[PDB]
Design a protein around this motif. Structure first.
Motif, PDB file in Angstrom:
ATOM      1  N   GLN A 177     -25.977   1.506 -24.271  1.00 26.33           N
ATOM      2  CA  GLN A 177     -25.059   0.453 -23.945  1.00 26.33           C
ATOM      3  C   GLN A 177     -24.307  -0.015 -25.081  1.00 26.33           C
ATOM      4  O   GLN A 177     -24.986  -1.045 -26.306  1.00 26.33           O
ATOM      5  N   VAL A 234     -33.557  -7.420 -11.254  1.00 26.02           N
ATOM      6  CA  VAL A 234     -32.765  -6.855 -11.174  1.00 26.02           C
ATOM      7  C   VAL A 234     -32.371  -6.202 -12.662  1.00 26.02           C
ATOM      8  O   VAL A 234     -31.167  -5.913 -13.025  1.00 26.02           O
ATOM      9  N   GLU A 235     -33.528  -5.935 -13.531  1.00 24.61           N
ATOM     10  CA  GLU A 235     -33.657  -5.531 -14.929  1.00 24.61           C
ATOM     11  C   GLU A 235     -32.466  -4.569 -15.269  1.00 24.61           C
ATOM     12  O   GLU A 235     -32.385  -3.558 -14.550  1.00 24.61           O
ATOM     13  N   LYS A 236     -31.704  -4.709 -16.403  1.00 25.98           N
ATOM     14  CA  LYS A 236     -30.630  -3.866 -16.894  1.00 25.98           C
ATOM     15  C   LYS A 236     -31.048  -2.485 -17.396  1.00 25.98           C
ATOM     16  O   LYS A 236     -32.268  -2.220 -17.097  1.00 25.98           O
ATOM     17  N   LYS A 237     -30.190  -2.058 -17.974  1.00 29.58           N
ATOM     18  CA  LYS A 237     -30.599  -0.761 -18.423  1.00 29.58           C
ATOM     19  C   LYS A 237     -31.134  -0.548 -19.725  1.00 29.58           C
ATOM     20  O   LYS A 237     -31.658  -1.441 -20.378  1.00 29.58           O
ATOM     21  N   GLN A 294     -25.228  -5.576 -12.050  1.00 32.15           N
ATOM     22  CA  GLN A 294     -26.460  -6.127 -12.946  1.00 32.15           C
ATOM     23  C   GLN A 294     -27.470  -4.985 -13.358  1.00 32.15           C
ATOM     24  O   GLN A 294     -28.513  -5.235 -13.601  1.00 32.15           O
ATOM     25  N   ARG A 295     -27.029  -3.761 -13.176  1.00 29.48           N
ATOM     26  CA  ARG A 295     -27.773  -2.492 -13.667  1.00 29.48           C
ATOM     27  C   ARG A 295     -27.312  -2.029 -15.202  1.00 29.48           C
ATOM     28  O   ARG A 295     -28.009  -1.862 -16.160  1.00 29.48           O
ATOM     29  N   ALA A 301     -25.851  -4.344  -6.758  1.00 29.77           N
ATOM     30  CA  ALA A 301     -26.853  -3.521  -7.545  1.00 29.77           C
ATOM     31  C   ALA A 301     -26.268  -2.732  -8.656  1.00 29.77           C
ATOM     32  O   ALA A 301     -27.067  -2.521  -9.619  1.00 29.77           O
ATOM     33  N   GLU A 329     -22.847  -3.427 -19.347  1.00 30.54           N
ATOM     34  CA  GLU A 329     -22.132  -2.800 -20.533  1.00 30.54           C
ATOM     35  C   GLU A 329     -20.810  -2.223 -20.231  1.00 30.54           C
ATOM     36  O   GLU A 329     -19.564  -2.688 -20.389  1.00 30.54           O
ATOM     37  N   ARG A 373     -17.734  -1.050 -14.963  1.00 29.60           N
ATOM     38  CA  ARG A 373     -16.324  -0.745 -14.275  1.00 29.60           C
ATOM     39  C   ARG A 373     -15.978   0.643 -14.180  1.00 29.60           C
ATOM     40  O   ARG A 373     -15.650   1.056 -13.208  1.00 29.60           O
ATOM     41  N   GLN A 374     -16.077   1.581 -15.379  1.00 31.09           N
ATOM     42  CA  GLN A 374     -15.691   2.707 -15.242  1.00 31.09           C
ATOM     43  C   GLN A 374     -16.995   3.583 -14.818  1.00 31.09           C
ATOM     44  O   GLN A 374     -16.872   4.937 -15.190  1.00 31.09           O
ATOM     45  N   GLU A 402     -10.946   5.962 -13.586  1.00 32.32           N
ATOM     46  CA  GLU A 402     -11.769   4.765 -14.091  1.00 32.32           C
ATOM     47  C   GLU A 402     -10.727   3.893 -14.625  1.00 32.32           C
ATOM     48  O   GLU A 402     -10.187   3.970 -15.889  1.00 32.32           O
ATOM     49  N   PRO A 403     -10.602   2.632 -14.315  1.00 32.98           N
ATOM     50  CA  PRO A 403     -10.068   1.617 -15.252  1.00 32.98           C
ATOM     51  C   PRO A 403     -11.068   0.919 -16.114  1.00 32.98           C
ATOM     52  O   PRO A 403     -12.030   1.296 -16.136  1.00 32.98           O
ATOM     53  N   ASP A 404     -10.779  -0.128 -16.834  1.00 33.22           N
ATOM     54  CA  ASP A 404     -11.379  -0.377 -17.985  1.00 33.22           C
ATOM     55  C   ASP A 404     -11.475   0.641 -19.103  1.00 33.22           C
ATOM     56  O   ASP A 404     -12.441   1.265 -19.005  1.00 33.22           O
ATOM     57  N   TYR A 461     -34.107  -6.997  -2.656  1.00 33.75           N
ATOM     58  CA  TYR A 461     -33.614  -7.325  -4.057  1.00 33.75           C
ATOM     59  C   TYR A 461     -34.856  -8.136  -4.899  1.00 33.75           C
ATOM     60  O   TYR A 461     -34.749  -9.308  -4.826  1.00 33.75           O
TER      61      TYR A 461
END
Ligand SMILES: CCCCCCCCCCCCCCCCCC(=O)OC[C@H](COP(=O)([O-])OCC(O)COP(=O)([O-])OC[C@@H](COC(=O)CCCCCCCCCCCCCCCCC)OC(=O)CCCCCCCCCCCCCCCCC)OC(=O)CCCCCCCCCCCCCCCCC
Ligand SMILES: CCCCCCCCCCCCCCCCCC(=O)OC[C@H](COP(=O)(O)OCCN)OC(=O)CCCCCCCCCCCCCCCCC
Lengths: 107, 56, 458, 141, 55, 83, 114, 51, 57, 173
Positions: free
Chosen positions: A45, H33-36, J112-113, J109, J116, J119-120, A11-13, H30
């Motif tokens: 988040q 595409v609402e987030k978490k 934009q899910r 997909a 935050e 990447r990891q 895992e980067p970042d 698509y």
């Protein structure tokens, strides 16, 4: 404190972290102060530059912001307490250069 | 949840209506600085709505 | 073309056969009926390729290119009636027939199926255009410019017959571009260099270079009556597309000597734009603009590898509508002021407010307003030659900056005061002046709605 | 159809007094500081007799200029010297040549050497020796 | 020939200054936080830029 | 938006006769010709209208301004006065 | 810079008979306004100062021209000069890039476009 | 009235563009595409809780 | 031309309409009502401070 | 519509708003009024077309091709067999373009899910998308023979260099 060995995943970042990244850390008192949770650090988040100390109090300080929706301030003493957790952490880190002027010179 | 951005597209559509009425297609008795000011006047509360859904 | 040349040749025994002044309204009426037949049988699908019928048509499959060829004849007759009506009727009708005859060779051209029918049609022009420069032009020094209109294109095109028959007797037959499957490679020699040289240099005679282009501001400067064949001379310059036909194959691998055609068309690109900010002629003003971003397409072709064929397909028609529209602006404002010199036109924008909108949007196609058909292709020329090297954005970007001044250098000349003169130039922009000024942007931004048809193979 | 002295000719010494003004009245009687001697230097492709250059220049600047229109807008009759560079250009102001802006841009040229230095807030300078001790030297205990 | 009586202009000025004064005090009053504040502003280093405005 | 007529300048040219303390308010009203009342009596007499009117007073305005009503005459041509 | 511009000089009494240079132009100005004021003109003035301007600028410079001086052959230092120099840049280019493209690699692996 | 001067202005194009989105999600793969969730405790929308 | 709502002057201090000055007066006070929240309750640094952080021993 | 295996995403997981306060909030006044002013002019007319569009049906059919030769047929100077192989190869390339567009939005997909972390996580799309486009420009992108389209006369001969110089001239692989 942190950074023992062997980040196994690719895992980067660096969110795949040893325990949690400090500012520099630790250095003296305490040499290990751990952190909080990491299964919920990625589940809830919470962005980078927020995995430092006083995190679980901040995860609860951010709870009542949504949990009081038509509100201007959830708990104003809690912001003074998260800052007191922050400022006492920072003054604990301000003891480096007094140590560095002292311990690094010849004796 | 579909009306989160749907009101934005309504806001991004009624600007063309003073332009569509420039083609002299049964246009209003002129009063055009007044008519434009009314056209802006109703978009603001339309713009005000999805700001509340974002901060939740 | 099954029957496209067939209806339009029947338009020719209709000019002198007709009555009196009915000949204008009759000739325009029939002409637009062919325009649907052009649209209908074409624009079919589409996957490599549409060999049309036989040995005379390959249907313009990879690049359509043929719709633009057919707007102009029901577009210039309304323009040429500005100052033509002073002669005998039999002499005026001959001037109508020669322009119609110009289209018929160019109708068979751009499709042409072959190469030995190409060159005879590649040279089938220059006979009617030359006669238009000789009779019913403007003031003197015509005849030398008629000679400079020859003796360059004919000077360079003659080694093509030296080249092509040398290919026809050597490897197969050049009747079919689609029987060009077996193509031997071409190595570096001292004989093969000239083989590529004669294959290319004739096409630089028409779309110009920094060299050999002095003739181009002669036909556009000394020009017929009010931009009459000058609009056709726009398609005459862009119609050197045949490099797309030929050098796609038939020594592709000689790129070691591509560089002096890359470089000369590049420093000459930035130069000829600034070679006209101190020009004193209106018809020369658009002429040097028509050199620069027409010289843009040449480095899109000799550099191979598409994302370069994409924009170069669209950049032929880019100024092809635009510079044709600018000449329509320049053909106007001359029946009212009988000198084409731009400095005398101080004090405009107040007498003609209706055409003042048309000055704005026309010159807004050189700044070109990126949702148009102009900056949709120039971004792909950026997308190609930046992969060549990192330096190429510099000289090509300043071309987007010099014509920013060079276009608004014309617009501000309309805005002045008190006009000093002009008990003539009264006419407040009659119906012929503005309906003909339309039908240029009206298909142009229309093509910007779904620009899918303006795309090569590619 | 104006043929008599329709342009300039191969001058500038083909009886230059008979040039101005038998036609092209740039000079009145060949002594007006605008007789067609000013063929810059010839041999090149410059102007010949050329009712043209080194006449008094550097601005038509749209002055007060009431005795005719006569400045730049309103067509004085025959005074052409040079054009196509002057609809956007002017005369001399009160200051003079002094290129102080490069000295004004030299204010950061002293601080361009300051761009090599560092900007840590605490503690103070004490620039005498290595007693400042920037980074980590020793371990925890 | 001074004149200040037009309620068209009075409508514009009154609408702004009500929103102008409460600009930074309502928007920033309710915002999800993004970063970490300073929270240390020492002696002789804290608010003297206000004193810079005074002189 | 406020217009102007002939009567405003007929006040002011007559008023500055009395405003200037060198000229008593006993002269002629509109035609005194200024020689009966080199520099500072063709410039100073209109340096006050440089303060009040002050439309830069061009070079030809000096030699016309002897007749004091001929001062008033061309202003209505410049200021575009009624009818 | 450009210029001083020497807006003041001396007089009294240099060249007493030099005056009435306006008599050249006021005669033309009288010829101008008499042409300008008429009950029916309906057209532009001929204005031969602009006739003698462009035609003695656009044309009649090559009949004026001769290559009898090297300051007329001085255009070799401006036309063909940088035109070799861009190729002198570009011939050093595209081959150093190619050798790193031939021998060794530096590109990303997801470079489909291009 | 304030009966049709605004009703032609704003109240009519509401239904047209919402139909252009309900007939859009079922066609295009698509949609929005609402987030978490961004949830710190565990709540009733799930079955588990968090301390 | 059409209206004489405000008179022309010759430097005699032409008076106001005496109704704009009420709204002029009102918003000179509610801006200094906002001197409440400047100090009450808001301080220059609600943070706390460091004792020149020496005691490493 | 489509198939969900082509476009996967994790389930939605939308929490509770948690008001907790007796203060009046405006979200209980917006969703309780605006829903019916949309459902009446839209859904009923959508139902009115729904019975009307089912009045008649019209058919459009799949187009499946026929691929008898593949590569090595035929001899050099031929025309007939070397025309169907062009129809083979070229239609075997426009398929391979939009396959990448599926995998490109598959990356979109994930991004934009989460947002935050972004990447990891998601464990595939930084790898698998780079296990496609990396295995793309080799031997399927005629670099830079894409101008003349390289129709069966250079797309095999990059793969001649991918077998002659590659994997044998490694000295000695
Ligand atoms: C008295 C009352 C009378 C009642 C009248 C009847 C009621 C109104 C009719 C209903 C609406 C029809 C009119 C068309 C506009 C709406 C189109 C639409 O959104 O439906 C989609 C619908 C598409 O059909 P579909 O079943 O959904 O799918 C088929 C395609 O696969 C779909 O994909 P695609 O291939 O179509 O690609 C999309 C795109 C691509 O289409 C293009 O852009 C190609 C056209 C340019 C090509 C380049 C040409 C260069 C030469 O199409 C569009 O451009 C849509 C933009 C709006 C239409 C463009 C208007 C042009 C004028 O309709 C169309 O887009 C067809 C376009 C035809 C345009 C006709 C324009 C008529 C205008 C009449 C004059 C009105 C003036 C009013 C002035 C009032 C005062 C200011
Ligand atoms: C100057 C003319 C230069 C021609 C030199 C002679 C070229 C020649 O000999 O032909 C080259 C070659 C055919 O000859 P070969 O080398 O033996 O190839 C095997 C086939 N026998 O292959 C060819 O046939 C090449 C055919 C193209 C070369 C002929 C045209 C070159 C001249 C075009 C230059 C531009 C025009 C300049 C003149 C017009 C302006 C005044």
């Amino acid at each position: 404190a942190r950074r023992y060995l062997g980040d196994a995943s690719v895992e980067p970042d660096p969110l795949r972290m040893p325990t949690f990244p400090p500012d520099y850390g630790f250095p003296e008192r305490k040499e290990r102060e751990m952190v909080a949770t990491q299964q919920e650090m990625n589940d809830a988040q919470l962005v980078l530059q927020q995995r430092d100390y006083c995190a679980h109090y901040l995860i609860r300080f951010l709870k009542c912001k949504r949990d009081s929706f038509p509100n201007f301030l959830a708990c104003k003493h809690e912001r003074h307490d998260w800052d007191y957790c922050e400022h006492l952490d920072y003054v604990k880190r301000m003891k480096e250069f007094e140590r560095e002027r002292r311990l690094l010179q010849r004796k | 949840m579909n009306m989160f951005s749907s009101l934005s597209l309504v806001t991004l559509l009624l600007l063309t209506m003073p332009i569509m009425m420039m083609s002299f297609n049964t246009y209003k008795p002129s009063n055009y600085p007044l008519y434009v000011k009314t056209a802006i006047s109703y978009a603001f509360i339309t713009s005000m709505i999805p700001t509340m859904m974002f901060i939740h | 073309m099954l029957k496209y040349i067939i209806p339009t040749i029947m338009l020719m025994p209709l000019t002198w056969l007709s009555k009196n002044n009915m000949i204008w309204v009759n000739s325009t009426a029939h002409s637009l009926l062919i325009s649907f037949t052009s649209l209908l049988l074409m624009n079919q699908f589409g996957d490599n390729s549409l060999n049309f019928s036989l040995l005379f048509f390959s249907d313009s499959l990879s690049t359509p290119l043929l719709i633009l060829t057919m707007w102009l004849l029901p577009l210039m007759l309304m323009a040429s009636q500005h100052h033509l009506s002073k002669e005998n009727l039999t002499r005026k009708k001959l001037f109508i027939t020669m322009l119609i005859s110009l289209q018929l060779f160019l109708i068979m051209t751009f499709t042409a199926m072959e190469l030995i029918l190409f060159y005879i049609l590649f040279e089938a022009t220059l006979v009617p255009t030359l006669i238009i420069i000789t009779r019913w032009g403007n003031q003197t020094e015509r005849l030398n410019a008629g000679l400079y209109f020859l003796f360059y294109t004919l000077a360079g095109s003659l080694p093509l017959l030296v080249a092509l028959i040398y290919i026809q007797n050597t490897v197969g037959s050049l009747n079919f571009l689609m029987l060009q499957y077996w193509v031997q490679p071409v190595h570096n020699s001292w004989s093969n260099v000239f083989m590529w040289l004669a294959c290319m240099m004739a096409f630089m005679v028409k779309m110009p270079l920094y060299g050999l282009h002095l003739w181009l501001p002669k036909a556009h400067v000394e020009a017929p009556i009010a931009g009459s064949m000058v609009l056709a001379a726009v398609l005459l310059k862009l119609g050197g597309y045949g490099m797309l036909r030929i050098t796609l194959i038939l020594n592709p691998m000689t790129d070691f000597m591509a560089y002096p055609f890359i470089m000369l068309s590049l420093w000459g690109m930035i130069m000829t734009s600034s070679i006209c900010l101190r020009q004193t002629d209106l018809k020369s003003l658009i002429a040097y603009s028509s050199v620069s971003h027409m010289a843009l397409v040449i480095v899109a072709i000799l550099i191979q590898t598409p994302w370069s064929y994409m924009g170069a397909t669209a950049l032929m028609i880019a100024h092809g509508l635009t510079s044709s529209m600018l000449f329509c602006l320049a053909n106007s404002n001359y029946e009212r002021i009988h000198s084409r010199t731009m400095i005398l036109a101080r004090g405009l924008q107040t007498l003609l407010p209706l055409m003042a909108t048309w000055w704005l949007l026309a010159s807004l196609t050189n700044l070109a307003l990126p949702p148009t058909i102009n900056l949709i292709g120039e971004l792909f020329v950026v997308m190609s030659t930046f992969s060549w090297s990192n330096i190429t954005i510099i000289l090509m970007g300043v071309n987007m900056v010099i014509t920013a001044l060079y276009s608004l250098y014309m617009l501000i000349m309309t805005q002045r005061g008190k006009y000093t003169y002009h008990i003539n130039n009264i006419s407040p922009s009659f119906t012929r002046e503005n309906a003909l000024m339309s039908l240029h942007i009206l298909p142009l931004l229309l093509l910007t709605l779904n620009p899918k048809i303006i795309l090569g193979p590619l | 159809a104006s043929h008599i002295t329709k342009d300039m000719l191969p001058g500038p010494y083909p009886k230059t007094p008979e040039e101005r003004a038998a036609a092209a009245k740039k000079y009145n009687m060949r002594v007006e500081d605008y007789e067609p001697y000013p063929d810059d230097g010839t041999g090149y492709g410059d102007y010949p007799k050329l009712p043209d250059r080194s006449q008094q220049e550097r601005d038509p600047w749209y002055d007060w200029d009431h005795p005719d229109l006569r400045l730049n807008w309103g067509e004085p009759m025959h005074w052409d010297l040079d054009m196509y560079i002057r609809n956007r250009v002017d005369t001399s102001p009160t200051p003079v040549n002094w290129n102080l802006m490069c000295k004004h841009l030299f204010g950061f040229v002293a601080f361009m050497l300051f761009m090599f230095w560092v900007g840590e807030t605490y503690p103070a300078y004490q620039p005498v020796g290595p007693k400042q001790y920037p980074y980590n030297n020793l371990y925890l205990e | 020939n001074i004149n200040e009586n037009n309620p068209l202009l009075i409508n514009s000025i009154k609408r702004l200054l009500i929103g102008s004064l409460f600009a930074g005090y309502i928007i920033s009053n309710n915002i999800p936080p993004t970063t970490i504040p300073q929270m240390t502003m020492p002696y002789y280093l804290k608010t003297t830029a206000l004193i810079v405005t005074i002189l | 938006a406020p217009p102007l007529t002939l009567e405003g300048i007929k006040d002011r040219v007559l008023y500055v006769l009395k405003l200037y303390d060198k000229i008593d308010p006993e002269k002629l009203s509109v035609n005194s010709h200024f020689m009966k009342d080199d520099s500072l009596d063709q410039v100073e007499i209109i340096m006050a209208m440089e303060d009040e009117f002050g439309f830069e007073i061009p070079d030809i305005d000096a030699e016309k301004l002897m007749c004091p009503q001929e001062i008033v005459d061309y202003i209505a041509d410049k200021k575009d006065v009624y009818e | 810079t450009t210029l001083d511009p020497a807006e003041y000089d001396i007089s009294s009494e240099t060249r007493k008979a030099q005056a009435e240079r306006l008599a050249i132009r006021s005669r033309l100005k009288r010829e101008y306004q008499l042409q300008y004021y008429d009950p029916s003109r309906r057209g532009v003035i001929e204005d031969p100062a602009l006739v003698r301007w462009t035609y003695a600028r656009s044309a009649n410079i090559y009949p004026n021209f001769r290559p009898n001086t090297k300051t007329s052959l001085l255009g070799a230092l401006f036309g063909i000069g940088p035109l070799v120099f861009w190729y002198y840049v570009f011939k050093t280019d595209r081959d150093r890039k190619e050798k790193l493209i031939q021998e060794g690699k530096l590109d990303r692996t997801f470079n489909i476009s291009y | 009235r304030h009966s049709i001067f605004a009703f032609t202005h704003v109240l009519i194009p509401v239904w047209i563009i919402h139909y252009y989105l309900k007939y859009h999600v079922t066609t295009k793969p698509y949609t929005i595409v609402e987030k978490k969730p961004r949830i710190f405790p565990g709540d009733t929308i799930l079955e588990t809780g968090e301390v | 031309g059409g209206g004489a709502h405000i008179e022309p002057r010759y430097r005699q201090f032409p008076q106001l309409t005496r109704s704009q000055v009420i709204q002029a007066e009102f918003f000179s006070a509610t801006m200094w009502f906002w001197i409440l929240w400047r100090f009450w309750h808001d301080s220059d640094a609600v943070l706390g401070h460091f004792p020149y952080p020496d005691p490493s021993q | 519509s489509w198939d969900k295996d082509v476009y996967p995403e994790p389930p939605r997981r939308t929490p509770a708003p948690s008001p907790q306060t007796s203060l009046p909030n405006p979200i209980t006044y917006l969703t309780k009024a605006f829903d019916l002013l949309v459902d009446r002019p839209v859904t009923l007319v959508r139902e009115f077309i729904e019975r009307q569009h089912a009045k008649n049906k019209y058919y459009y059919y799949h187009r499946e091709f026929r691929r008898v030769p593949d590569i090595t047929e035929c001899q050099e100077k031929d025309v007939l067999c070397m025309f169907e192989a062009e129809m083979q190869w070229r239609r075997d390339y426009k398929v391979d373009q939009e396959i990448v567009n599926i995998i490109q939005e598959r990356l979109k997909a994930c991004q934009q899910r989460e947002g935050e972390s972004h990447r990891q996580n998601c464990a595939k799309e930084l790898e698998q998308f780079t296990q496609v486009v990396k295995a793309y420009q080799d031997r399927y992108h005629d670099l830079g023979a894409h101008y003349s389209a390289r129709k069966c006369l250079a797309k095999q001969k990059q793969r001649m260099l991918a077998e002659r110089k590659a994997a044998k001239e490694a000295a000695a692989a």
